[PDB]
UniProtKB/Swiss-Prot annotation:
Assigned GO CC terms: collagen-containing extracellular matrix; cytoplasm; cytosol; endothelial microparticle; external side of plasma membrane; extracellular exosome; extracellular region; focal adhesion
Annexin repeats: 13-84, 85-156, 168-240, 244-315
Subunit note: Monomer. Binds ATRX and EIF5B. Interacts with hepatitis B virus (HBV).
Modified-residue entries (N6-succinyllysine), positions: 288
Record-linked InterPro entries: Annexin, Annexin_repeat, Annexin_repeat_CS, Annexin_sf, ANX5
Gene for this chain: ANXA5
Cross-link Glycyl lysine isopeptide (Lys-Gly) (interchain with G-Cter in SUMO1), where in sequence: 27
Originating organism: Homo sapiens (Human)
Domain comment as written in the entry: The [IL]-x-C-x-x-[DE] motif is a proposed target motif for cysteine S-nitrosylation mediated by the iNOS-S100A8/A9 transnitrosylase complex. A pair of annexin repeats may form one binding site for calcium and phospholipid.
UniProt GO BP: blood coagulation; negative regulation of apoptotic process; negative regulation of coagulation; signal transduction
Protein name according to UniProt: Annexin A5
PTMs per UniProt: S-nitrosylation is induced by interferon-gamma and oxidatively-modified low-densitity lipoprotein (LDL(ox)) possibly implicating the iNOS-S100A8/9 transnitrosylase complex.
Motif extent ([IL]-x-C-x-x-[DE] motif): 312-317
Disease: Pregnancy loss, recurrent, 3: A common complication of pregnancy, resulting in spontaneous abortion before the fetus has reached viability. The term includes all miscarriages from the time of conception until 24 weeks of gestation. Recurrent pregnancy loss is defined as 3 or more consecutive spontaneous abortions.
C-alpha cells in the first residue's frame, strides 16, 4: 500500500562511532573497502551526512575527499553518489546532463518524467540555490524542438489533482492522442503535450485504456524504443511513468545492463536515487517484467567491491 526503498535508518545510530569506523578503514597505507561499503550501504543518506560532520569534527579531515583518494573506479563513483545529499542529487544530475552539445538527454528525460510534481518543485528550488540559474533556462538553452517544450511543461509541475473520472474527457483525450500518434507525433505538439503533461495520473491511466480499445494497440506501440527521437523517448518515459514509476525505472535498469557493455552511470543513478523511495517496488516490477531478479543481473554484470555495494543496495534476491 506504500512505496518503499531498500535503505532505512540504522538502529542505534552513533555518528561518532561510524566516523571512527570509517577512519579506521582508511588510516594508513591500507584500505578496508569491505568495512566502508558495509557501513555506508546500511546507513541512510541523512545518517551519512551526520557521519560526514562527525568525521570532520573528530579528525579535522573531509570524509568525501578521503573516500575519493582511497577508492577508485566504479566503486568510488558509487560511494560518492551515495554520499551526495538526497536533496541535491537530482539537481546535480540535471546540471551535469546540461552540458552543451554533449547534453545527456537520457538523464533529463529519466528524472523529469518520473519525478512527482512535489519532487520537481523541490528540485527547481535547489537547482537555483546551487548554480545561480533556473533549471528551465538551462533546459531551454540546451534542448530544442518540442522535446524542450515537453520538458518545460513537465517542469512546471502543474499536473491536475487526482479527482473524479470524467468519462467524456477520457474519450475526447484518447481520440486526440490516437490522431496525434497517427501523425507520428509531429503535428499539433502543444495539444498532446498538454494532455501528457497537465492531465492527472489517474485520468491518463484511463485515457491509455480507452486508447487500447479505440486503436487495438497500446499507446507505447506508436514509438520505437530504440530509433525514436528525443520527444518520442520522453513521451515513452512519461507514458510508462504514468502507468507505474517503479516499472519505468525498472525497465531503465534492465536496458542499462542488457546487451553488450554496462551503462554504469544509469545503474548507479537509479540504484542510489531510489534507494530510500521505491527501489523495493522497482525490484518487484523488475522480476515480474523481465523474468529475472535485479540482484542476479547485477551479480552477472559487475565486479569487485562495486558489485558488493550494489548487491547490498539491492537488499536481497527476488524469487
Ligand atoms: Ca589508506
Ligand atoms: Ca586499513
Ligand atoms: Ca580515486
Ligand atoms: Ca526533490
Ligand atoms: Ca547496456
Amino acid at each position: 500500500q506504500v512505496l518503499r526503498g531498500t535503505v532505512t535508518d540504522f538502529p542505534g545510530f552513533d555518528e561518532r562511532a561510524d566516523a571512527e569506523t570509517l577512519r579506521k578503514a582508511m588510516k594508513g597505507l591500507g584500505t578496508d573497502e569491505e568495512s566502508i561499503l558495509t557501513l555506508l550501504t546500511s546507513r541512510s543518506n541523512a545518517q551519512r551526512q551526520e557521519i560526514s560532520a562527525a568525521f570532520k569534527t573528530l579528525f579535522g579531515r573531509d570524509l568525501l575527499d578521503d573516500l575519493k583518494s582511497e577508492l577508485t573506479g566504479k566503486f568510488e563513483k558509487l560511494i560518492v553518489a551515495l554520499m551526495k545529499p538526497s536533496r541535491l542529487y537530482d539537481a546535480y544530475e540535471l546540471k551535469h546532463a546540461l552540458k552543451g552539445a554533449g547534453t545527456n538527454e537520457k538523464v533529463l528525460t529519466e528524472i523529469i518524467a518520473s519525478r512527482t510534481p512535489e519532487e520537481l518543485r523541490a528540485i527547481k528550488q535547489v537547482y537555483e540555490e546551487e548554480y545561480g540559474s533556473s533549471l528551465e533556462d538551462d533546459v531551454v538553452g540546451d534542448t530544442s524542438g518540442y522535446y524542450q517544450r515537453m520538458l518545460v511543461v513537465l517542469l512546471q509541475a502543474n499536473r491536475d489533482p487526482d479527482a473524479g473520472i470524467d468519462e467524456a474527457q477520457v474519450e475526447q483525450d484518447a481520440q486526440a492522442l490516437f490522431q496525434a500518434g497517427e501523425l507520428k507525433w509531429g503535428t499539433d505538439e502543444e495539444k498532446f503535450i498538454t494532455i501528457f503533461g497537465t492531465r492527472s495520473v489517474s485520468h491518463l491511466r484511463k485515457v491509455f485504456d480507452k486508447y487500447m480499445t479505440i486503436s487495438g494497440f497500446q499507446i507505447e506501440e506508436t514509438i520505437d524504443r530504440e530509433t525514436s527521437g528525443n520527444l518520442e523517448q520522453l513521451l515513452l518515459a512519461v507514458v510508462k511513468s504514468i502507468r507505474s514509476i517503479p516499472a519505468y525505472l525498472a525497465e531503465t535498469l534492465y536496458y542499462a545492463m542488457k546487451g553488450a557493455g554496462t551503462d554504469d552511470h544509469t545503474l548507479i543513478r537509479v540504484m542510489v536515487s531510489r534507494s530510500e523511495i521505491d527501489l523495493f517496488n522497482i525490484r518487484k516490477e523488475f522480476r515480474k517484467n523481465f523474468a529475472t531478479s535485479l540482484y542476479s543481473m547485477i551479480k552477472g554484470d559487475t565486479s569487485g567491491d562495486y558489485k558488493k555495494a550494489l548487491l547490498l543496495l539491492c537488499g536481497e534476491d527476488d524469487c
